[PDB]
């Protein structure tokens, strides 16, 4: 084969070769409306899809809850005080005690699912601030102990719907007798050790209180595996960090609440058995 | 209209007018086999079917669990001693703490479902007995108090998977201070007040230990309503009564166990909301 | 919403069919039918309570 600028393959094995404001969306029995939402982000431009047999690893017939699990669950609300650094919720670990989705993911061994995350935070025309919502895939976070690595515990690494928080400054877990085994992600490093500024490479939106009060993210199912355990592996992760601090009428104690509404989409399960009863506290 | 042996209708309203051994069946991830089962009874000759829109009362999109709920759940086992009169399990009240079917029926307001009941009881060629399994529709049972009627409580009328038992002789609940509000169905009267002999009008099978050791009943969804609450109304009811007492080698203490395996079929639900948490004990 | 033009917010209007504990917190209401009403510009919101009933009719 004479290629343009003589390529002959001598080895059978291949490895040996050479080198917009208005929005209303309905999922099941749940409906979401937002008159000042600045469009949606289809993360990586891929809508969630059911597993296709062409790339199907397991054989067992999949149980798709459909309406009973592809609903919008509103996680708890969090106050965005002036001196707040951020929050992070891992998925689907957040939807583990939410309706029938939690039951299905605990009962079934393997499970895949996309998500639709709607972050809601509204302020008056006289408020001043801006949030950034990033859907970090495979979101890891740094530990708190400099004497050990990858030492975080299951209970502390999976807060649930309560979520987690970013700390302004790192603080080693100096306790050498009973280490807390707890995440200590620095806000500007984003926890992973990278920089916040570059974090925009991830699928993201910005809730700028002057322009929009909502942020919609359609997160597909990204994973090295077509289907994987939901109780072990947390595919995505939502991180909400305030790019610019809240401010209002020269008032030093302004608070506004931020809410999340997550809807599993095209969620499929396999491998039914006794129900997982994990230790979380 | 001159009809054969002058019929004229004078009133607009219509009311004013004049007048075999081998069996193996798979549901979801569950499989049942029986080499000496004497065929199956499709109660009333109607296979369970999903609700058809032509006769659909509610509008809400129905959640059909399909594989996750149309499985074979094996209820507890019961010893068929010589001096045992019978047992009765109400459905779907039996499958209220069985896998995801219980969760779906508690979460959803309305729910319909057929069933496949497999009664299993095996004995040696030297055993002697015969059971009768009747799928009583709308199975009511008589109360224990002669001073009041329809006084049974929800907790006592819905034993769950434990089931109930038939008593040999009636015994009034003479306690007038705190009535037990408990069923007291006489065995030969079948509880309803009818006779046992006629009970064969209901869909039924007989487990005759000489011939067969299993009984399969495919119960459709019979109800005055297309779909109805599952936590209030118990559509069917299984009653197992020993037609001929157990006997074995002149031994006065022969026991054999009887097991039930119930599989919801074509189960559909509507009306999702907060989860019912009923008082049962 | 008969309020001022600068009053912005959101509400949850929920319909929960019968047969369970009546909703008393937003935690339980969302599980039923619900609509999120934005009070930004339009002053009105419609919740179509569907026909969920075991019987074909209901007594008055």
């Amino acid at each position: 084969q004479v290629s343009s600028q003589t390529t002959i393959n001598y080895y059978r094995d291949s490895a040996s070769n050479a080198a917009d404001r208005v929005l209303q969306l309905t999922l099941g029995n749940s409906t979401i409306t937002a008159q000042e939402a600045a469009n949606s982000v289809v993360a990586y431009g891929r809508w969630p899809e059911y597993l296709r047999d062409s790339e199907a690893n397991p054989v067992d017939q999949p149980t798709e809850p459909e309406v009973a699990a592809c609903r919008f669950y509103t996680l708890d609300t969090v106050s965005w005080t002036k001196e707040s650094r951020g929050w992070w919720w891992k998925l689907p670990d957040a939807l583990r005690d939410m309706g029938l989705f939690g039951q299905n993911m605990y009962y079934h061994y393997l499970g895949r699912s996309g998500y639709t995350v709607h972050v809601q935070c509204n302020a008056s025309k006289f408020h001043q601030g801006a949030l950034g919502v990033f859907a970090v895939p495979e979101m890891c976070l740094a530990g708190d102990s400099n004497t050990t690595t990858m030492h975080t515990s299951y209970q502390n690494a999976n807060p649930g719907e309560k979520g987690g928080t970013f700390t302004g400054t790192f603080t080693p877990d100096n306790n050498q007798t009973s280490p807390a085994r707890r995440f200590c992600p620095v806000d500007y490093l984003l926890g992973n050790g990278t920089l916040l500024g570059n974090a925009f490479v991830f699928p993201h939106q910005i809730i700028n209180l002057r322009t929009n009060n909502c942020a919609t993210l359609v997160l597909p199912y990204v994973n090295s595996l077509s289907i994987d355990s939901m109780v072990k592996h947390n595919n995505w992760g939502i991180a909400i960090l305030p790019l610019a601090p809240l401010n209002f009428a020269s008032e030093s104690s302004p608070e506004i609440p931020i809410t999340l509404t997550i809807a599993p989409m095209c969620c499929e399960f396999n491998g039914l058995r006794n129900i997982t009863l994990p230790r979380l506290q | 209209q001159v009809s054969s042996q002058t019929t004229i209708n004078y009133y607009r309203d219509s009311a004013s007018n004049a007048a075999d051994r081998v069996l193996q069946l798979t549901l979801g991830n569950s499989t049942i086999t029986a080499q000496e089962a004497a065929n199956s009874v499709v109660a009333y000759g109607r296979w369970p079917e999903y609700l058809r829109d032509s006769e659909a009362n509610p509008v809400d999109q129905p959640t059909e669990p399909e594989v996750a709920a149309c499985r074979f759940y094996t209820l507890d086992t019961v010893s068929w001693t010589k001096e045992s009169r019978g047992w009765w399990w109400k459905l779907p009240d039996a499958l209220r703490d069985m896998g995801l079917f219980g969760q779906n029926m508690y979460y959803h307001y309305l729910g319909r479902s057929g069933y496949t009941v497999h009664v299993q009881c095996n004995a040696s060629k030297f055993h002697q007995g015969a059971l009768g399994v009747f799928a009583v529709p709308e199975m009511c049972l008589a109360g224990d108090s002669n001073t009041t009627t329809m006084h049974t409580s929800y907790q006592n009328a819905n034993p769950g998977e434990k089931g109930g038992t038939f008593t040999g002789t009636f015994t009034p609940d003479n306690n007038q201070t705190s009535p037990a509000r408990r069923f007291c169905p006489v065995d030969y009267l079948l509880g309803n007040g009818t006779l046992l002999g006629n009970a064969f009008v209901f869909p039924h099978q007989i487990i005759n230990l000489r011939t067969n050791n299993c009984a399969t009943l495919v119960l459709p969804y019979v109800n005055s309503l297309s779909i109805d609450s599952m936590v209030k109304h118990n559509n069917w009811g299984i009653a197992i009564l020993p037609l001929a007492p157990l006997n074995f080698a002149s031994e006065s203490s022969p026991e054999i166990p009887i097991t039930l395996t119930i599989a919801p079929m074509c189960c559909e639900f509507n009306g999702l909301r907060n989860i019912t948490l009923p008082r049962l004990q | 919403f008969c309020g001022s033009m600068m009053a912005t917010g959101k509400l949850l209007v929920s319909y929960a069919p019968p047969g369970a504990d009546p909703p008393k917190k937003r935690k339980e209401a969302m599980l039923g039918t619900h609509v999120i009403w934005d009070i930004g510009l339009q002053s009105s919101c419609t919740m179509v309570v569907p026909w969920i009933s075991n019987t074909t009719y209901r007594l008055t």
Partner: peptide, 27 residues
């Protein structure tokens, strides 16, 4: 007369927002 049939529906993501209206008009 047979009242209107309750037609089927599914998930939607449009911006028509028929749910929100204005009662100020008399319609």
């Amino acid at each position: 007369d047979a009242l209107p049939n309750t037609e089927a529906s599914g998930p939607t993501h449009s911006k028509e927002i028929p749910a929100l209206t204005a009662v100020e008009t008399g319609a």
